[PDB]
Symmetry: D2
C-alpha cells in the first residue's frame, strides 16, 4: 500500500511540524525547517505541501528575510518535485486576532486581517496554489453580548467579497474554500458546520469563486455524519478541497492521523470520494501526538496515506462484489436514484395507485434488508469475505 505522488496526498507544514505545545504542556519536539519537511514528505510518497503565511515566513519578517525564506522553499520544491496546491493565512495565532480577523469588533484589526490575507494570496499564486483556504478560527464568541452575529456575518461577507474583487481584478486563477469548525479556540465559532458555510456562500457577490474545505474531526465535534456532509457539498458542486484526520467523538479537536478515530466513517468517506470521482488533493491536517519523537512523526504521516489506500481497496472491492450489487438492489438503492414523479404534478395527482388504491400495509411489511447490506460492508472492510 505504497503511496506515490499520483495519489495526490498533501500535508500542512504545521502538521508534521507541530512541536507538541497543548493547553496544558510545553513543546516536546524541536522546530522543523520547512525545507526538511518537504524532503521527508517527498521520500514518503507525498504529492505536495500546504502552508499558512506564518509557517513559511516568521511573523514580522523584513522584506529581505521574506525573499530568502521563499527562495529556500522554492529550491526544496524544485529539488523534490513537490507541489503547493493550497495555501492559507494565519488569522488566529497573534494576540491582535484574539477577537477575530475578518469579524473582530475593532475595525482597524479587520482592515489589517484583509491586508495580511491579500499579501499571502499573491504568494500562493506565485507558488502555484489553486485553492486558498480560510479558517476563521477566532471568528466567534465566549459570551452572548460580545458579538452581534448579523453584524458579524455582514463583516464576513464584506471581507470575502473584497477578496473576490481582488482575485478577479488581478486575473488570478485561484478559488476560495471556507473551512468550518463548530468551536475551539472560541467558545462558538461562526459558520460552525459544512451546512452553515454552504448557505453563507450563496449570499456572496460571486458565489462561483467559493466552496468549502471540510475537515473530518471538525464535523465530528458537532456529532455529525462526515460522509453525509461531504455528499451535500458534492451535491452543491462545492467540494473544492478536503482535510483528512481522525477524531474520537465530541471533545477537543484531537487531529489524530487519518483512519484513527471513527474507522467506519473513514471507510464510507473513502467510498464516497472515490465513487464521486473527487479529483482534488487528499490533504492531511493532523498532529503526530506529542508522545512521539521525530521517528513517530514520520510513522504517523506515513500511516495517514497507508490507511487511505487500504480503505480505498476495501471500498472498491465492496462496490465491485456481485453479491453486494445484488444486495443494493434488494435494498432498493436503484429505486432511490429514479425520479419520484418524472410524469409530473398533474399525473401524480391523478394517479390512484399513489394514494386512493395504495396498499400501505403491504408496502410497510417490505423489509429494507439494510442489516445484510451493512454486514457485507463490514466483511469487506475487515477482509473477511
Amino acid at each position: 500500500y505504497q503511496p506515490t505522488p499520483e495519489d495526490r496526498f498533501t500535508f500542512g507544514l504545521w502538521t508534521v511540524g507541530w512541536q507538541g505545545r497543548d493547553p496544558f504542556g510545553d513543546a516536546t519536539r524541536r522546530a522543523l525547517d520547512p525545507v526538511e519537511s518537504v524532503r521527508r514528505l517527498a521520500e514518503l510518497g507525498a504529492h505536495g505541501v500546504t502552508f499558512h503565511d506564518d509557517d513559511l515566513i516568521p511573523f514580522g519578517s523584513s522584506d529581505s528575510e521574506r525573499e530568502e525564506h521563499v527562495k529556500r522553499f522554492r529550491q526544496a520544491l524544485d529539488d523534490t518535485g513537490m507541489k503547493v496546491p493550497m495555501a492559507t493565512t494565519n488569522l488566529f495565532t497573534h494576540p491582535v486576532f484574539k477577537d477575530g480577523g475578518f469579524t473582530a469588533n475593532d475595525r482597524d484589526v479587520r482592515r489589517y486581517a484583509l491586508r495580511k490575507t491579500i499579501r499571502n494570496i499573491d504568494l500562493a499564486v506565485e507558488l502555484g496554489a489553486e485553492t486558498y483556504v480560510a479558517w476563521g478560527g477566532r471568528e466567534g464568541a465566549e459570551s452572548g453580548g460580545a458579538k452581534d452575529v448579523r453584524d458579524a456575518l455582514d463583516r464576513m461577507k464584506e471581507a470575502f467579497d473584497l477578496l473576490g474583487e481582488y482575485v478577479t481584478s488581478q486575473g488570478y486563477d485561484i478559488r476560495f474554500a471556507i473551512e468550518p469548525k463548530p468551536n475551539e479556540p472560541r467558545g462558538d465559532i461562526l459558520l460552525p458546520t459544512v451546512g452553515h458555510a454552504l448557505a453563507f456562500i450563496e449570499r456572496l457577490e460571486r458565489p462561483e469563486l467559493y466552496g468549502v474545505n471540510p475537515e473530518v474531526g471538525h464535523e465530528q465535534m458537532a456529532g455529525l455524519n462526515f460522509p453525509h456532509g461531504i455528499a451535500q457539498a458534492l451535491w452543491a458542486g462545492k467540494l473544492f478541497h478536503i482535510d483528512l484526520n481522525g477524531q474520537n467523538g465530541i471533545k477537543y479537536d484531537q487531529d489524530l492521523r487519518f483512519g484513527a478515530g471513527d474507522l467506519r466513517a473513514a471507510f464510507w468517506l473513502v467510498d464516497l470520494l472515490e465513487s464521486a470521482g473527487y479529483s482534488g488533493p487528499r490533504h492531511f491536517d493532523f498532529k503526530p501526538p506529542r508522545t512521539e519523537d521525530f521517528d513517530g512523526v514520520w510513522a504517523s504521516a506515513a500511516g495517514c496515506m497507508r490507511n487511505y489506500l487500504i480503505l480505498k481497496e476495501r471500498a472498491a472491492a465492496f462496490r465491485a462484489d456481485p453479491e453486494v450489487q445484488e444486495a443494493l438492489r434488494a435494498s432498493r438503492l436503484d429505486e432511490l436514484a429514479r425520479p419520484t414523479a418524472a410524469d409530473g404534478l398533474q399525473a401524480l395527482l391523478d394517479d390512484r395507485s399513489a394514494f386512493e388504491e395504495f396498499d400501505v400495509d403491504a408496502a410497510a411489511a417490505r423489509g429494507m434488508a439494510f442489516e445484510r447490506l451493512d454486514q457485507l460492508a463490514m466483511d469487506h472492510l475487515l477482509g473477511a469475505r
Copy 2:
C-alpha cells in the same frame, strides 16, 4: 407575566396531547380530544394551535369521519378565537415511512408521501395557516450503504419543487419551512442543522417560497449555539417560524418546556428575536414529562409562556440600561456594525495605516471588556441590578 393572544404563543396538538409513551414505557395519560386542548389553551392565554394531519384526523379516516373531525375542530376555534397559523404532515409514525417519506428508497412510498402532504396543504389553507412545516424525521440512515445521499437530496429537491409547483398552481398564500434535526429517530437525519437546510433551499426552483423552522433542542443536540443559528437564519431572511423548548445538552431529544435546559441560551434567543422584530408565532414544541397528570400538563404549558415573558422583560431591561449601552461601546459593538472598507478595495490597498504602519502590539493590548459586559447581562437576567 400573564400572556395574552397578542403575544402570539402557539402550541402543537401533539404537545399537551402527548400521552407519555417513550422508548421504554407505556402511556401514563389518556388521549386528549383536540377540542378540549383548544379550549384549555385559550383559557391559558395562547393565540393558537398547530397540527399534523394525523393529530386532527385519525389515520385511515373515511371522507365522512374526516369532515366531522374538521367541523368539530372549526367550531372550537370559532368558540375561542384561536387561530391555526401553521400545519404539517405526519410522515414518520406509520410503518410505511420506516425508511422515510420523500427520500424512501421505495418509489411508491415517495409518491404516497407527496400525495399525503398535498391533501393536508389544502386543509391547512382552508384553516387559515400561513406556514406549512416539513420535518423529515425519517429521512436518513443507520448505516452507510443504505442511502446514497446525493440521490436522496435529488429526491428531496424533487419533492419540495413539486410542492412549490402545487402551491403556485393553486394560487395559495402559504410558504414552506424546513425543520432540521441532526438525529433521532434515524441514526443520522438528512439536513441535520439550520445551516444544511438553508444551503439546500438555495438549490430549489423557487427558493423564495421556503425558509426554516428551527427548534431549540434540535440544534443543541448537535452542541451548536441556537441564538447564533437563528441570527444566520434572520440574516438570510429565512426565519419563517420557530419552535421553542428546552434541552440539556447532547442526548436524546428531551422536549422540556421553554426556559428549562440552557437558561442563558433562552435569554439570548429572546433578546435576538425581540430586537430583530421577529413577528411570527412563538410556537412551543415540547412534551409535559410523563411523570405529570393533566394538572401538570397545563402547568407545564403555562410555564412555557411565563418564561418567555420573564426573559423578554430582562432582555429589554438589559438593552435599555445606559450602563450596558456604555459597556457595549467599551467592547466596540458599535465598530462591528460599521463597514470594514466602505472606502473600497483600492483605498484599502493604498492605506498604510491598515498594514505598513499598523501598530499590531498596541491593538493586541486593548482588552475587549467582554467579561464586564457578560456580568451585566447575568445581573439583568437574575434581577440583581
Copy 3:
C-alpha cells in the same frame, strides 16, 4: 466464523423480539413467541437467552397463565439445549414506575418494586440463572427539585441490601450486577457510569454479592472509553456480566448490532476480554433496526456473533505477532507492569537517581513509539499485515 454454544453468546428475548416501536413511530414487526426466538437463536449458534419477567410472563398474568408460559419456555430450552444464564426485572415499562422503582418518591411503589423483583429472583434461580441484573432506567429526574439524590441513594442502598438479605436467607447461588446508563428514558439516571456503580457497591452491606453489567452503548453515551471502564471493572474484580452492542457517539441509545458503531473500540474491548480471560456470557443487548423484516432480524443477530469472532481472531493475531511484541517493549509496556518502588518509600526518598541526579531532559526526549504500535494494531484489525 461460525459460532457454537461454546463461545457463550447470549441474547435478550427483548432484542430479536423488539417490535420496532420508537418515540416517533409504531411497531413495524409482529410480536415473537419466546419459544420461537429460542429455537431460531439456537439454530444460529447462540448458547442461551435472558429475560425480564415481563418478556416471558405478560404483566398481570394469573398464577395459572404464569405456570403455562414457564412450562412452554422450559420445553423450548430442553428441546434446544439453550441455557438461561441471566435474568432481570422490568421496573421501567408500566406507568406505575414513571418516577422509578427502587427510588420512586412514593413509598408504596418502592415496596411494590421490591416484591416484583423478589418474585422474579425465585424464577431466575429455578431456570438456572447465575446473575441477576438490575437496570434502574427510571431512577433519576428531569428537574433538580424532584429528587433529593442523597435520599435516593439511601433508598437504592436499602433496596439492594434487602435483596442481598433475601438471596442469602434463601441460600441461593446468584449474584447481582448493576447496569449503569447516564440518561434515557430519564433526563439523568442515578449511577450513570461504571465508575458510579462500582463506588456505590462498596457501601452495600455485602459488597461481595454485587458487581456491574456495563453496556457498550451506555458508556459511549457519556463519551467515555468503554474498554478503559471495563479494565477498571476487571481490576476491581467486579465484571460479572457484559452487554455488547454498537453506538455512534453521544446521542440517543441506538442499540446497533455489536461491531457497528465504534469499530476500533469493539476491537480493543475484545482484546481485553480475551486477554483477561473473562469467562462470563457475551450477551447482546441490541435492536434490529425497525427498517428490517424478520429475515433482517436474524441477519442482525448473526452479525453480532460474527463480528465478535472476527475481532477475536484479529486481536489474537495482534498479540501473537513478534513484531508487535517488539513494538510493545519499544513503547515500555513491559515497564508499566513493573512496580514503581518495590524497594519502598525510604529507599525512594534516598535514591538520588529519582530526583537530585535525574536527567529530566534526556527522559523527556525519549519518544514513546505509540504511533507505530497503533498502526500495527490498525494493520492487524484490517487484515493488512
Copy 4:
C-alpha cells in the same frame, strides 16, 4: 452581594495568572507576580489562594531561589491575611510527563513524579494547607495499545499508597483529593469521572485519607449532571474540596467563570452545597478569557464570587418559601426520605398491600407535580416570585 473572607472563596495562582496561551494562540497578557495576585484577590474579598509547585517556584529553581520565592509569598500572605488551604503538584506541563507522571510507561519517570510530589507536600504543610489535590491530567492514552489500564491502575494505586505512607509517617494533618477529568490533554484520562475516582479510592490501603475534588466543567464534559455527582460524593463522605467554574456542554474545557455555562446547574449545585452544610473552600479553577486585559481579569474573578452569592440567596429563598415546602410534599419528597421497609424483609414479604392487593393503576394515575415545583424553582432563580 459583596464577598468577605468568611465566604471561603479561593482561587488558583494559575487562574487569574493565566496568560492566555491556547492550542491556537500566543499569550495575550504578561505574567503576574504571585504576590500581586495575592494582594489583588484579598482586595476583592477572597479568603485564600492555591498553587501548583511550579506556579510558585519556577521549574528548575535552585534551593536558594526557592527559599526566596517562598519568603516573598509568605510575606504577602501575612500582609493580607490570605490563607493557603489547598496545594497541588504540576505533573503535566514539562515534556518529561508527556505519557503521565504516576502511570508513565517509563519507571524512572514515575519515581521522579513521586519525588516531585513529596517535595511539594512538605511545602503545602508548611504553608498550612489542609488538602493536597492530585489531577492526573497526563494519565491516559490516545491509542488502545499504548496503556494497559489494569497495570496503570496498579501503578496509580502504588503511587497513592506511597503518598499515604509518607503523610502518616511524617504525622502530617493533610488529606488527598483526586480530581477526575474525562479527556484533555490526553485522548482519554484514567479515573474520568467522580464515580471512577470514588470506586478507585476504596481499593487504596488507607481509603480514609483520600476523597475527591470534582470540577463543574469536568463532569459536564462527559454530559453528566454535576449536582448529582456531588450528591453521590457527599453521600460517601468524600467531598474534601470542590472546584467551581462554567462550561457550555461537551467540548474542550472552557474554564468560564462560575455562573457562566449551565446557570440552572450552578443554582442546583449551590442549593446542595448550602443545604448539606459543606464547609470546605469554594475554589474557582477558571480562566479569564484571553480577550481580556487585566481589568477584565479582576472583573471575571469578582463575577465568580458574585454569582455564587446571588445563587445562594435564591436557593435559600426557594427552600424557605412555604409554597415550595408545600410543593415538595405534593411531590412526595418527604416520602423519599422515609425508609422503604424499616419493618424488615419478612414483614415486606408478608405484606399483601405491597403486591397481592396493591392497586398499581391507582398508584400509576397519581401525578408527581414536578413541573409546578420546577417552575417555582425557575421563578425563585429569576427573582420573579
